[PDB]
Every structure is written in structure tokens, then in C-alpha cells.
A paper describes a structure:
PAH is the enzyme that catalyzes the hydroxylation of l-phenylalanine (l-Phe) to l-tyrosine (l-Tyr) using non-heme Fe(II) and tetrahydrobiopterin (BH4) as cofactors, and dioxygen as additional substrate. In mammals, PAH has a major catabolic role and its dysfunction is associated to deleterious hyperphenylalaninemia and phenylketonuria, whereas as we have recently shown L. pneumophila PAH (lpPAH) has an important role in the growth of the bacterium in media deficient in l-Tyr and in the synthesis of a brownish pigment called pyomelanin. Similarly to all other PAHs, the activity of lpPAH is totally dependent upon a non-heme ferrous ion, but – in contrast to all other studied PAHs which are iron-bound tetramers (eukaryotes) or monomers (bacteria) – lpPAH is isolated as an iron-free (apo) homodimer when expressed recombinantly. Molecular and enzyme kinetic characterization has shown that lpPAH is well suited for catalysis at human body temperature, revealing a maximum activity around 40 °C and very high specific activity compared to other eukaryote and prokaryote PAHs.
The best crystal diffracted to 2.5 Å and in the observed electron density maps the dimeric lpPAH structure is clearly defined, in particular for chains A and B. Thus, the current model gives good insight into the lpPAH structure. The catalytic domain of other non-heme iron- and BH4-dependent aromatic amino acid hydroxylases (AAAHs) has a mixed α/β fold, also found for the reported lpPAH structure. In agreement with the dimeric nature of lpPAH in solution there are two dimers in the asymmetric unit, formed by either chains A and D or chains B and C. Here there are strong ionic interactions (<4 Å) involving Asp198A-Arg247D, Asp228A-Lys172D, Arg247A-Asp198D and Lys172A-Asp228D. In addition to the ionic interactions, which appear to seal the lpPAH dimer together, the interacting interface is composed of the β-strands Val201-Arg202-Ile203-Leu204-Phe205 and Val223-Tyr224-Phe225-Val226-Ile227 from each subunit, and the adjacent hydrophobic C-terminal coils (Glu251-Asp259) where the two Tyr257 residues establish an important stacking interaction. In lpPAH (chain A) a water molecule is found at the similar position as Fe(II) in other PAHs in the metal-bound holo-form. From the observed electron density it is clearly a solvent molecule and not a metal ion, in agreement with lpPAH being isolated as an apoenzyme. One striking feature in lpPAH is an extended aromatic cluster protruding from the conserved active site residues Phe91, Phe92 (Leu in hPAH), Phe100, Phe139 (Tyr in cp, cv, hPAH) and Phe162. In lpPAH the cluster is extended by residues Tyr143 (Tyr in cp, cvPAH), Phe205 (Phe in cp, cvPAH), Phe211, Phe236 and Phe244, and enclosed by Pro207.
Numbering used by the authors: 8 to 259
The structure:
């Protein structure tokens, strides 16, 4: 459960909440160097993220906005799929104003202010990415609830768990990877996962499990790949994905 912010956006966190931010921050920072994409590296710097206190949203927002028109909006712990996408649509990234507990450090299903401000926001400082996230949200109206599961599949294999094969090698952009210490090493160093060439139809055909280290990642060679995809008519990729069948899981 979350804090409710004051007249002017500020939120009264105390020491313990701050230490956990700190332990989370300190340990992810170490692993980033050969693993996160350059754009993530600099987004973090651009966003002013201290390894010491939980940020105040106004300042973070102000910084995001000046890079790409995005902002951060404070919300409660359990917002709905619709509320998430309605916010992304108006260029606001939702930030729940609580942090995971000491006991819930390593794995955590309910996304907190670390998951958000550390894992996701920093990639929203890259212009083509920020524009793809926004267009993507927007187009998820236009679509009926019957199609959001496939749209939420695609989101999982890009915004959350996507990799980018760069000239200096494989890196990760996914905010679900970059906020977890386990994923961040595994995603680009293990011989277990299958890494597939990002293609819209095949991501739509790929099933997934939330709580588990991902057995399949999709690889992009430029954020422009995600941009062309959503400036092209989804709908058509989605049907097609349905006429060929859902693939069999690699997990169980």
C-alpha cells in the first residue's frame, strides 16, 4: 500500500523504505555494465536516480518530460490493465508509491516504485522508444478487450523482456529484466533460453509464464523495429497469428 502525495507531489518516505531502495539500487547498478543497453544507461543518468533515497516524482517527471514529453503519475498499488494503458496513452508512466518489503526483495509479482522508476522509465528517455510505447498504448484502444491478451503478450516480449542485438553484442532493454538481478544476468549469459529474431507474428504466437525466468526472449536490432511494427496494422499480424496456431510452451 501506497503513500498519498502532498499538495506539491512530495512523499514522506522514511529510512527503512529508503534502505531497501538503496539495497535494490546498489546491487542492480553493479550488474548493468555489460548487460543493459546504452539507452538505459544514459536514461538512468538523465533521470537523476540517486542510490540513496526513493526519488520524488516531480523532479523525475520534469526530467523525463524535457527528453520526450513523458511524465510520471503517482498511483495506488493495484491498478487495472485498462488504467495502465489509459495513462500510457496520455504519455504518463504510472508509479505506485510503495516499495517492496525486506522479505520480498529478490522476486516480486506486484510491481513497485523500483520496478517502475528504475526498470522502465529510463528507456522512456529515448525518443523512438518513447514514441513506440505511446503509440502502442494508444492503439490498444481501437482494440476490444478480446484482443488485449495477445496485445499484452507482445508487450511482455518487448517493453518487459526484450533484448537488442547491438554492434557490441546482445543487451537488454526490457524493464522487467533490468529491475531484477536474476533476469539481468541470465538474459544475456545463460545457455538455457531460446533467443528468437523479433518478428510480430511469432511473438503473437508465443505463450508465456509470469513467475519464472523467461525461457524465450525476442531480439530486436533497433528500436525502429518496434516503431515500424506499430505504424503497421496490428490486427492483421494478430489474425494470422491466430490462423497459424499458438506454439507449444518451452516452459511448464
Amino acid at each position: 500500500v501506497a503513500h498519498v502525495p502532498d499538495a506539491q507531489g512530495l512523499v514522506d518516505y522514511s529510512a527503512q523504505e529508503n534502505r531497501i531502495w538503496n539495497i535494490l539500487f546498489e546491487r542492480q547498478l553493479k550488474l548493468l555494465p555489460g548487460r543493459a543497453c546504452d539507452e538505459f544507461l544514459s536514461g538512468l543518468q538523465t533521470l537523476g536516480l540517486n542510490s540513496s533515497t526513493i526519488p520524488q516524482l516531480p523532479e523525475v517527471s520534469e526530467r523525463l518530460k524535457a527528453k520526450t514529453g513523458w511524465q510520471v503519475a503517482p498511483v495506488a498499488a493495484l491498478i487495472s490493465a485498462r488504467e495502465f494503458f489509459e495513462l500510457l496513452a496520455e504519455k504518463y508512466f504510472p508509479a505506485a508509491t510503495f516499495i517492496r518489503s525486506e522479505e520480498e526483495l529478490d522476486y516480486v509479482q506486484e510491481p513497485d516504485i523500483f520496478h517502475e522508476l528504475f526498470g522502465h522509465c529510463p528507456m522512456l528517455t529515448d525518443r523512438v522508444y518513447a514514441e513506440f510505447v505511446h503509440d502502442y498504448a494508444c492503439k490498444v484502444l481501437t482494440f476490444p478487450e478480446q484482443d488485449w491478451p495477445l496485445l499484452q503478450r507482445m508487450f511482455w516480449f518487448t517493453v518487459e523482456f526484450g533484448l537488442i542485438k547491438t554492434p557490441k553484442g546482445l543487451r537488454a532493454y526490457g524493464g522487467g529484466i533490468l529491475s531484477s538481478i536474476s533476469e539481468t544476468v541470465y538474459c544475456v549469459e545463460s545457455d538455457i533460453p531460446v533467443r528468437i529474431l523479433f518478428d510480430p507474428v511469432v511473438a503473437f504466437r508465443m505463450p508465456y509464464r509470469i513467475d519464472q525466468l523467461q525461457p524465450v526472449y525476442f531480439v530486436i536490432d533497433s528500436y525502429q523495429n518496434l516503431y515500424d511494427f506499430v505504424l503497421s496494422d496490428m490486427g492483421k499480424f494478430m489474425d494470422r497469428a491466430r490462423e497459424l496456431g499458438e506454439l507449444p510452451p518451452y516452459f511448464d
